[PDB]
Amino acid sequence: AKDAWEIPRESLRLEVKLGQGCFGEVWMGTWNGTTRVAIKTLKPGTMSPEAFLQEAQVMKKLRHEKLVQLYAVVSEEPIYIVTEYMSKGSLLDFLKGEMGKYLRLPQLVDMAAQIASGMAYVERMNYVHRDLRAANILVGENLVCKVADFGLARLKFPIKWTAPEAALYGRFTIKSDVWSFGILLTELTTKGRVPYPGMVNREVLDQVERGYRMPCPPECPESLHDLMCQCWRKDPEERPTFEYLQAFLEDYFTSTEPQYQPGENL
Numbered sequence: 001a002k003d004a005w006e007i008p009r010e011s012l013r014l015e016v017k018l019g020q021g022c023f024g025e026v027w028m029g030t031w032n033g034t035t036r037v038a039i040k041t042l043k044p045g046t047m048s049p050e051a052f053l054q055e056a057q058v059m060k061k062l063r064h065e066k067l068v069q070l071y072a073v074v075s076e077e078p079i080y081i082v083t084e085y086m087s088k089g090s091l092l093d094f095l096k097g098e099m100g101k102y103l104r105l106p107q108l109v110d111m112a113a114q115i116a117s118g119m120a121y122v123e124r125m126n127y128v129h130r131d132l133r134a135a136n137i138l139v140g141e142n143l144v145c146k147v148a149d150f151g152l153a154r155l156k157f158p159i160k161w162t163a164p165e166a167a168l169y170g171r172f173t174i175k176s177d178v179w180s181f182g183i184l185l186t187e188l189t190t191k192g193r194v195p196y197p198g199m200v201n202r203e204v205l206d207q208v209e210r211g212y213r214m215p216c217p218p219e220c221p222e223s224l225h226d227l228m229c230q231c232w233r234k235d236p237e238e239r240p241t242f243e244y245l246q247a248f249l250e251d252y253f254t255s256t257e258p259q260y261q262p263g264e265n266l
């Protein structure tokens with residue numbers, strides 16, 4: 001039985017390749033010769049088609065302004081995942097590009113508050129992302145940020161972004177996503193730097209297990225680092241909700257850091 005979101009591969013035109021990944025490619029194209037779309041292609045053998053269709057039933061129920069809207073799916077290998085096209089691409093690309101030097105703390109916190117908003121909806125909908133990182137956040141015009149690839153990680157493991165209980169025991173919850181968000185905050189405040197710079201995956205897992213946490217990034221206020229440390233609490237239940245995170249980040253420059261003033265890069 002054909003899924004409502006299942007479409008023929010023929011109805012798609014793969015016009016411009018936007019990037020290359022480990023498991024596939026990302027293209028800019030057209031669907032039914034009228035809609036500009038983004039197409040994530042997956043190499044055959046990288047994902048089970050049946051498992052993806054079952055997981056896509058949950059994603060169909062998820063409708064939010066800060067979530068990338070899923071349009072269509074091609075269930076036959078190579079699997080094609082069709083969404084709305086986002087003007088500036090990945091948040092990591094945007095931070096590591098020409099724009100990243102002009103982004104200050106107000107713009108970065110605004111983007112974080114938008115990601116927290118998308119994730120607070122995921123939280124309320126009793127869902128889990130599993131791969132919350134800058135690379136999986138899409139940017140458009142007016143710093144519009146949208147959470148992408150929700151629940152696809154389960155179907156190159158990002159040790160640096162994963163909570164210890166999830167990386168070591170497979171305990172993937174909304175609280176492990178909160179840990180990942182704290183790591184995402186580190187990517188924003190350092191403007192696209194890799195977490196725990198200079199440390200290999202084994203050193204990270206060994207140090208974080210011993211209680212190590214990334215220090216306050218240069219010229220980042222202690223209050224924002226304190227929030228990162230709240231996301232990085234050892235006990236998953238002690239970590240803040242995304243609902244709390246969104247509110248804290250939305251109100252940041254009034255209720256928390258009104259003494260904020262621009263520095264060299266923040």
Ligand SMILES: Cc1nc(Nc2ncc(C(=O)Nc3ccc(Oc4ccccc4)cc3)s2)cc(N2CCN(CCO)CC2)n1
Nearest residue numbers: 018019038040081082083085086087088089148149150152
């Ligand atoms: C990499 C890239 N993507 C662009 N736009 C994009 N819009 C959407 C994209 C995108 O990544 N789409 C996408 C589609 C389906 C996916 O699958 C799932 C989604 C949700 C749940 C489960 C699976 C995953 C991802 S990519 C634009 C772009 N540009 C335009 C801006 N240029 C200059 C810099 O601003 C650089 C090239 N570069």
